Amino acid sequence: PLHKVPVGLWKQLRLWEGIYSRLPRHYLRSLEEARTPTPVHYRPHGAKFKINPKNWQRERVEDVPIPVHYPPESQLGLWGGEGWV
Amino acid sequence: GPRALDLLRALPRVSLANLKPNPGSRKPERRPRGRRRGRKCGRGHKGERQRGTRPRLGFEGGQTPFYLRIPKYGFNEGHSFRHQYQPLSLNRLQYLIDLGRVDPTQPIDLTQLVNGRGVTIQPSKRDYGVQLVEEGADTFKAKVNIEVQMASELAIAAIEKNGGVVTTAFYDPRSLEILCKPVPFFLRGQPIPKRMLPPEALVPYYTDAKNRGYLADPARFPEARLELARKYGYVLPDITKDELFKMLSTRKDPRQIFFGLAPGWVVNMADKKILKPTDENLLKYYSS
Amino acid sequence: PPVLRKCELPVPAHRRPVQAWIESLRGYEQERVGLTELHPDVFSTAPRLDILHQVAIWQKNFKRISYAKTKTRAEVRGGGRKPWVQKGSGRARHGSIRSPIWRGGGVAHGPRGPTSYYYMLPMKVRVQGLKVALTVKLAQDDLHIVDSLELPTADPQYLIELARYRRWGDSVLLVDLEHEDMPQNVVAATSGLKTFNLVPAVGLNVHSMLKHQTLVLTLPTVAFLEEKLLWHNSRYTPLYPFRLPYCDFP
Amino acid sequence: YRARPPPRRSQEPRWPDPDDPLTPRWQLSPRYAAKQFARHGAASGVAAGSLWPSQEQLRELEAEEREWYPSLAAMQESLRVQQLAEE
Amino acid sequence: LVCPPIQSRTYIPPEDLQSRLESHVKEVFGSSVPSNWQDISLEDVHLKFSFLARLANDLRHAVPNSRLHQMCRVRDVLDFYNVPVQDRSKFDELIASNLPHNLKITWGY
Amino acid sequence: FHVRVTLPPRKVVDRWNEKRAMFGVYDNIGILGNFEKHPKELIKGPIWLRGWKGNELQRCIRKKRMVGNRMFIDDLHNLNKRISYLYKHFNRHGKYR
Amino acid sequence: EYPSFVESVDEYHFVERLLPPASIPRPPKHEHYPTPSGWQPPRDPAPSLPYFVRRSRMHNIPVYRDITHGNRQMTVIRKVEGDIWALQKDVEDFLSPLLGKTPVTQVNEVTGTLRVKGYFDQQLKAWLLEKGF
Ligand SMILES: [Mg+2]
Ligand SMILES: [Mg+2]
Ligand SMILES: [Mg+2]
Ligand SMILES: [Mg+2]
Ligand SMILES: [Mg+2]
Ligand SMILES: [Mg+2]
Ligand SMILES: [Mg+2]
Ligand SMILES: [Mg+2]
Ligand SMILES: [Mg+2]
Ligand SMILES: [Mg+2]
Ligand SMILES: [Mg+2]
Ligand SMILES: [Mg+2]
């Protein structure tokens, strides 16, 4: 048999029920939106479109963040948004 | 008509009970049971193959494979970016006009050809449109206003002699897709986009009156046009004095996809209404 | 008053239409209440039992989804471990005790997953199938064009005995033009019957026509079918789906 | 017996709950709204003015179009130079 | 609401056929008979319907829906009604066919 | 090989029950219905299987793409393993190459 | 801040052009037959022959060619309503003076179809035109 709601949404609908419902709305709206963190270790290319050097064609290009690990001792200080690669 | 019907009075009801697939329709499958198809069951004996493990397709048994000893050469090189023009012979055009699929009375562009199913465009395959080829040149008697994306001297010559007009226009891939299947686009709920210009390689094509390019200087048209007569030895008619002339002169804006509609409008097909932007910025963008 | 029905669509020059009695359902005794022309390209089509077969089989199968599942030696409960050592124990060598050889073990091939049998016979073939079914129902005398469908009463016994008096056979398929417009006497009578079945035009199909011994078509129903089926001989291949705007087409 | 009522395609405009988490994110798009307009559009309850690019969207379309699609004059100029160098 | 007892469909043509059919030719078409009365065409639907319905109530026998495309002249209706139709089965045809003494058939249905 | 000694209760199937009498009724819904609904719509079944078909690998692969995140752990794991198996088998094994 | 718009019904006849027909148009009457592309319509009456050949939905004569195994060339005559055996007789009597021998044939009586060995497609369209089908 199947779960009616996808498990990825089990974290979210955990917050729509119980005591989390009674939390102040501004707080929940500060947690909801995850803004993309400023690039630190990887260096981003500005353009959305980039001409393929080999091909000579206009290519769509995206920026993919490099996963960085933050040891818990980084939570005691301020490391400048960076951490272990 | 069908004398078969008269044999059906005599015979029992057609029911679900007696129904035969046409003989030969089903070749019966065979299973590895019994003395014939059992005992090694068509798999041979031992080795790699009876066990089902023989190597991949190109593999030659360790000697350098045939498809890899041959050297690489650009053949299909950049194939995806080559332009593709679907050919339309004058023979097919004539045959379509004769049978009343496309009518020569109103102007003929890509949408008209597609709607008569005289031609099929698939932009996803990088079709840039129809090209006109001369196969039926001698036989061609029709009088038409035609717009294609490419044409041959001979084809043009064969259309002029009959008192029509050819013009080569360009459509970019998006434009093209919209052009060929307009009604699927009008359900899309988007404005009518600008027609893009041709890329730098194709500019010397559409700027020439030789090709009767849509970007060409009309001053050269009546000159070059007459030239085509001297070569093929026929009297060039005066298109001006004809009764259908107002239709024959009909162009598109180089920035327009259709006839009589304009970039930036919106077609609401349920209300049978058109919607146009009153905004200044929008009107500057769409009209540029 | 004689009810005479002329065809509403062009017949080919080389072919005359076909004719059938218009029967009325009100009296037991009124058998021929009128005269009708049916179109030769629908009811006179060359009988094709081969295509009938294709379409009946299609109707049967294309809907079908088998939920029959067996566990492979992978999905069975346990037996990740070699039940004894490869050599010296003196007996046959085995990996998992859930191997398809073993008693409780996994099934070697067997049915797998919910399976769909789904396919589409090309349009023109299903159309042709319908034409042929109609043709054959007619040629074998088992098709009856009825006017009306107004019934004198809601007693189903009336209907049974009516079918007995006209020798209609055991089962009867009553086709009506739309679902809401069905007369209430009919609906009452036919809701309590097993063999007599009332169905709207859009629910006409090959299977049901071969299941019931006798077909009864309303007059507007004929005028409907004739047009719907005939439409396909003259039509282009679809550019995009027909549910979208077309020039002439609804 | 008598058959069920025939299955029919409702031609009314269809709007899914924007607040129901079980709803697919493709049916919440602007694109879905526009399509819902082009299907009906009077009865849709879609603002027609919503079918055009915003000031932001328009400025970006503008910027992009001016970047990757040159002027006719700019291109003829571009070609004459190449032809010159080849000569 | 009563139900009339079913007809047996067993049909033999009567000797008066020609006269019945020509009388119906005259009264249905309302026409003084053109010299050949059996060769007149049934193409009109009023005339065909009235003619055949009258034949049906007179002769206690009707033309089946399949054969109604087959009747053009009146000659066709003549020829149709000349041929008898037995509603007895093959079995029932064998009971009455004068069987030898050494063959007994018993019906066990 | 011992065979059952008692005649089973003879099962009477009436073919005129509702489900059998109404079978295949709306199959022509597209043609006769001025095409709006394709016969696919009539198909009652698993979500990933409606109006679609394919060999066991394709089937599994599709099930995972559609409902794979609504699945129970054990069943998802089993599915992944089945997919991997079928992949290896179809691609690398057989007579015909 | 939705920009302003204007609703007019008057250009919609330009959209009406773009709708494709779902049915195939009956061919236009001409003043001269055969037409430039060589298409000739069927006759006003139909011949007396005990068979008939329907036109294609596109109004052409249903004679096609077919290959199999790359070397087997055939010609199919389709949509034959009538005594097909008649048509077989006439077709082999027509083709015989060409090959010196009777052409090999297959008659499908249920399909309403004739099938001939070799490519005779042109000459057969000509011959079926002459008989006015
Ligand atoms: Mg097998
Ligand atoms: Mg063997
Ligand atoms: Mg053995
Ligand atoms: Mg061995
Ligand atoms: Mg060996
Ligand atoms: Mg193509
Ligand atoms: Mg295991
Ligand atoms: Mg282990
Ligand atoms: Mg031992
Ligand atoms: Mg092992
Ligand atoms: Mg088990
Ligand atoms: Mg072939």
Q: What CATH number does residue G96 fall under? A: 3.30.780.10
Question: Would an 8 Å CB–CB cutoff place E41 in contact with chain C?
Answer: no
User: Cα–Cα distance between D35 and C172 in angstroms, integer?
Assistant: 46
CA angle A66, A70, A76 (to 5 degrees): 150
Which chains lie within 8 Å of chain B at 3 or more CB pairs, if any? A, C, D, F, G
Q: How far is F72 from chain C (nearest CA, A)?
A: 14
- Beta carbon pairs, C and E, within 8 Å: 57
Q: What is the chain C residue with the closest CA to G53? A: C14
Helix (H) or strand (E) run with residue F63 in it? helix F56-67
Q: Are strands C65-67 and C143-146 parallel, antiparallel or unpaired?
A: unpaired
In a domain, residue B224? The reply is yes
Q: Given an 8 Å threshold on Cβ–Cβ distance, is D62 in contact with B285?
A: yes
User: Which three-class secondary structure string do you get for chain D?
Assistant: CECCCCCCCCCCCCCCCCCCCCCCCCCCCHHHHHHHHHHCCCCCCCCHHHHCCCHHHHHHHHHHHHHHCCCHHHHHHHHHHHHHHHC
> Which chains have 3 or more CB–CB distances shorter than 8 Å to chain D?
A, B, C, F, G
CB atoms within 10 A of CB B122: 12
B5 close to C15: Cβ distance less than 8 angstroms: no
Q: Which of B54, B56, B57, B59 to mutate to test the interface with F (most CBs of F within 10 A)?
A: B54
Rounded to the nearest 5 percent, the helix, strand and coil shares of chain G are 25, 25, 50
Q: CA dist C126 to C59, C134, C205, D44, F37, Å?
A: 10, 13, 9, 36, 15
Largest CA distance in chain F: 59
How many Cβ contacts (< 8 angstroms) between chains A and D? 9
Phi and psi at C191, nearest 5°, equal -80, -25
Between E45-59 and E17-29, two packed helices, what is the crossing angle to 10 degrees? 140
Q: How far apart are CA B250 and CA B264, in angstroms?
A: 21
Q: Is A57 on the interface with B (CB under 8 A)?
A: yes
3-state secondary structure of G59: coil
Spatial contact of B46 and C75, defined as CB atoms under 8 Å apart: no
Which domains can be identified in chain C, with CATH numbers? 1-250 (3.40.1370.10)
Distance, CA of B279 to CA of C194 (rounded, Å): 67
Has G93 been labeled as part of a binding site? no
Q: What is the 3-state secondary structure (H, E, C) of chain C?
A: CCEEECCCCCCCCCCCCEEEEEECCCCCCCCCCEEEEECCCCCCCCCCHHHHHHHHHHHHHCCCEEECCCCCCCCCCCCCCCCCCCCCCCCCCCCCCCCCCCCCCCCCCCCCCEEECCCCCCHHHHHHHHHHHHHHHHHCCCEEEECCCCCCCCCHHHHHHHHHHCCCCCCEEEEECCCCCCCHHHHHHHHCCCCEEEEEHHHCCHHHHHHCCEEEEEHHHHHHHHHHHHCCCCECCCCCCCCCCCCCCC
For residue B57, tell me if it sits in a domain: no
**Which residues does G25 contact at the CB level (< 8 Å), separation at least 6?**
B99, B100, B101
* Measured distance CA(C225)–CA(C51) in Å, rounded: 19
Ligand 11 geometric centre to CA of F59 (Å) = 23
Q: Look at residue B72 and tell me if it is in a domain.
A: no
Domain of residue G22, residue span: 1-133
| B12: closest chain C residue by CA | C140
Q: Give chain B's domain count.
A: 1
Cβ neighbours of C46 (radius 10 Å) = 21
Two tokens, residue B251: 């162009």
Is the Cβ pair C179, D1 closer than 8 Å? no
- Are E21 and E55 a contacting pair, CB within 8 Å? yes
Long-range contacts made by residues A50-55, C-beta under 8 angstroms, separation at least 24?
A55/B78, A55/B81
Best CA proximity match to C75, nearest among C41, C113, C45? C113
Residue whose tokens read 């069927």: G42
Q: How far from A37 is each of A11, A34, C227, CA to CA, in Å? A: 22, 9, 65
Distance of CA B273 to the CA centre of its chain: 30
Q: Is residue B86 part of a domain?
A: yes
Task: Give the bridge partners for A84, in sequence order.
Answer: A69
Q: Does residue B187 contact residue B145 with C-beta atoms inside 8 Å?
A: no
SS3 call for F32? coil
* CB-based contact D7 F26, cutoff 8 Å: yes
Comparing CB atoms, the residue among G18, G36, G83 nearest residue B182 is: G18
Cα angle: F40, vertex F44, F47; to 5 degrees: 85
C236 at the G interface (CB within 8 A)? yes
Task: Characterize the bridge pairing of strands C65-67 and C114-116.
Answer: antiparallel
Q: What does each C-alpha distance from G47 to C14, C44, G59 come to in angstroms?
A: 9, 21, 18
What is the C-alpha end-to-end distance of chain G, expressed in Å?
68
Residue of B nearest to A54 (CA): B78
Q: Which of B170, B172, B183, B281 to mutate to test the interface with D (most CBs of D within 10 A)?
A: B281
Closest ligand (CA of C75): 7
Is the bond leading into G34 cis (omega within 30 degrees of zero)?
A: yes
Contacts of F78 by beta carbon, 8 Å cutoff, 6+ apart: C74, C75
The F residues from 44 to 63 touching C (CB cutoff 8 Å) are 45-46, 49-53, 56, 59-60, 63
Cβ neighbours of residue D85 closer than 8 Å, sequence gap 6 or more: none
Residue of G nearest to C233 (CA): G57
Q: Does D66 reach chain B within 8 Å, measured CB to CB?
A: no
Within-domain flag for B137 = yes
DSSP tag of G128: H
Nearest chain D residue to C244 by CA distance is D39
* Cα separation, B149 vs B131, whole angstroms: 6
The DSSP call for residue F76 is H
For residues C199 and C212, give the distance between their C-alpha atoms in angstroms, rounded to a whole number: 12
Q: How many angstroms separate the CA atoms of D83 and E56, rounded?
A: 96
A52-A53-A56-A60 Cα dihedral, nearest 10 degrees = 10
What is the 8-class DSSP label of residue G12?
G
User: Ligand nearest B37 Cα, by number?
Assistant: 2
* Count of beta carbons in the 10 Å neighbourhood of residue A59: 10
Q: What is the nearest CA distance from C179 to chain E, expressed in angstroms?
A: 28
Q: Could you identify the residue written with the tokens 């008989």?
A: G131
Q: Helix, strand or coil for residue G7?
A: strand
Q: Please tell me the distance from the alpha carbon of residue E37 to that of residue A58, in angstroms, as a whole number.
A: 89
Q: Where are the beta strands (DSSP E) in chain B?
A: 84-89, 127-133, 145-148, 150-151, 165-168, 266-268, 273-277
Chain F interface includes D25 (CB < 8 A): no
User: Given the structure tokens 């068509």, which residue do they identify?
Assistant: B42
Positive or negative: CA dihedral C201, C206, C211, C212: positive
* Secondary element (H or E) of residue A70: none
Asked whether the beta carbons of residue F71 and residue A2 sit closer than 8 angstroms, the reply is yes
Instruction: Name the residue type at position B49.
Output: R
Alpha-carbon gap, residue C102 to C72, rounded angstroms: 12
Q: For residue F62, what is the DSSP state?
A: H
Paired tokens of A39: 């690039």
| Total domains in the fold of chain G | 1
- CA distance linking residue D29 with residue C79, whole number of Å: 50
Question: In chain A, which residues have their Cβ closer than 8 Å to the Cβ of F70?
Answer: 2-7
Burial of D51 (0-12, 13-18, 19+ CB in 10 A): buried
Pick among F49, F71, F73, F79 to test the A interface (most A CBs inside 10 A): F71
Give the single-character DSSP code of B207.
Answer: T
| E94 token code pair | 């064998």
User: In chain B, which ranges are continuous DSSP H helix?
Assistant: 4-10, 34-37, 66-69, 90-98, 110-115, 153-160, 173-180, 182-186, 203-206, 221-232, 245-248, 280-286
DSSP H/E element including G81: strand G80-82
- The method of structure determination was cryo-EM
Do the chains contact at B56 and F95, CB–CB below 8 Å?
no
For the four alpha carbons of C237, C240, C246 and C250, in that order, the dihedral sign comes to positive
Domain range for B190 is 81-288
What is the H or E stretch that residue G106 is in?
strand G105-108
